Every structure is written in structure tokens, then in C-alpha cells.
Amino acid sequence: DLILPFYKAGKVSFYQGDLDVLINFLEPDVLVNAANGDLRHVGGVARAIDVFTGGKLTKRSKEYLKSSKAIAPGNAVLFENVLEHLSVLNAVGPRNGDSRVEGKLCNVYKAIAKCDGKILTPLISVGIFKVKLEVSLQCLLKTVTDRDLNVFVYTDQERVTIENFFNG
Ligand SMILES: [Cl-]
User: Fold this and answer.
1) Domain containing residue 139: CATH number
2) Distance of CA 111 from the midpoint of ligand 1 (Å)
3) Which helix (H) or strand (E) holds 77?
4) d(CA 148, CA 168)
5) Can you tell which superkingdom this protein's organism belongs to?
């Protein structure tokens, strides 16, 4: 077997590594994307997935927008099959220091919880959105109470920070 999780906690598995490669070998079904909610797809995740889908993501997005409402931090929306057997879920995390940063985040995990098949997803609202990893995790673990989930990060420091979460 090839890409192995570097930590495992309940049915959540944590992977480090590049995106395309993860998608490629982990073969998911739902790729959760971290999107800033009026839906320009910039930075490590989104600018990533968009490119991988040949930019279909963005094409569906402008489309989406004409007959549907911008996504409200604390909400996510699903684009079914942006590729064949590849669904992208557009998660809008809260910014740092809006209110119930807490609650909002958890709904996002909660909504993610809800999907079908293999999920690959990054940690919401971490990175540019400047929310502590501790929390996005804290929330993650709480919410997706029971289902297999595939979380990925990019950095080392990230990877580590996660390990010490479980060690203490
Ligand atoms: Cl909703």
C-alpha cells in the first residue's frame, strides 16, 4: 500500500503530502475545499483543486452564483461531480475573531460529516483565515463523531503540531 497516514485517531486518519498525490492515491469521492465564501479559489487548497480539475471548479462556481446565494461562513455547499466521481464541497470556515468562531466551525465539520464515500479534507479555517490549529482540530474531533475521514496537511510543523495534540 502507498500513502500512509502519519497518525490515526478513531477513524480519522491524518496524512501529510501534496494534494494531487493525495487525491491520486487515496482516491476520494468528496474533496472538501476550504473556500473564502464569495468563492474566488485562491491559495494552497482551493488554487490547488481548481487547477487539478482543469479549472472546472471555478467554471461551476460562476455558474452556481447566478441562481443561488453566497455561502455563509459556518456553511458549506456541494458541487456534485466536478469531475467524474470527484465531488467538491465548498466549505466556508469562519474568519478569525468573528463570533462563535467556535460554533460556526463546528457546523462546517458537521456538514462535512454528512457526505457519502471517501472524504478528503484539510483543517478548516487554519492557514490564511488565521484560526488556531488546536481549535479546528478540537472541533473536528468532537463533531465527526463517527465516520472515516481523511485529513491532510501540508507542512511539517503542522504534522508535528498534530502529533503533540494526541501525545500532550
Ligand atoms: Cl446550509
Assistant:
1) 3.40.220.10
2) 8
3) strand 76-83
4) 23
5) Viruses
Cα–Cα dist 76/93, whole Å: 8
Q: How far is the C-alpha of 113 from the C-alpha of 60, rounded, in Å?
A: 23
Interval between CA 155 and ligand 1 midpoint (Å): 31
Resolution in Å, one decimal place: 3.9
b/e map of 80-99 (b: 16 or more CB within 10 Å)?
A: eebeeebbbbbbbbbbeeee
Residue 16: how many CB atoms within 10 A of its CB?
A: 19
Is residue 165 within 8 Å of 137, Cβ to Cβ?
A: yes
Method: X-ray
Q: Between the CA of residue 8 and those of 152, 154, 155, what are the distances in Å?
A: 12, 17, 17
Going from the Cα of 74 to the center of ligand 1, the distance in angstroms, rounded, reads: 8
Total domain count, the chain: 1
Cα of 152 to ligand 1 centre, how many Å? 24
Q: What is the Å distance from ligand 1's center to 98 Cα?
A: 19
Interval between CA 72 and ligand 1 midpoint (Å): 8
Q: How far is CA 47 from CA 34, 106, 119, in A?
A: 10, 24, 19
Its domain, for residue 160, covers 1-168
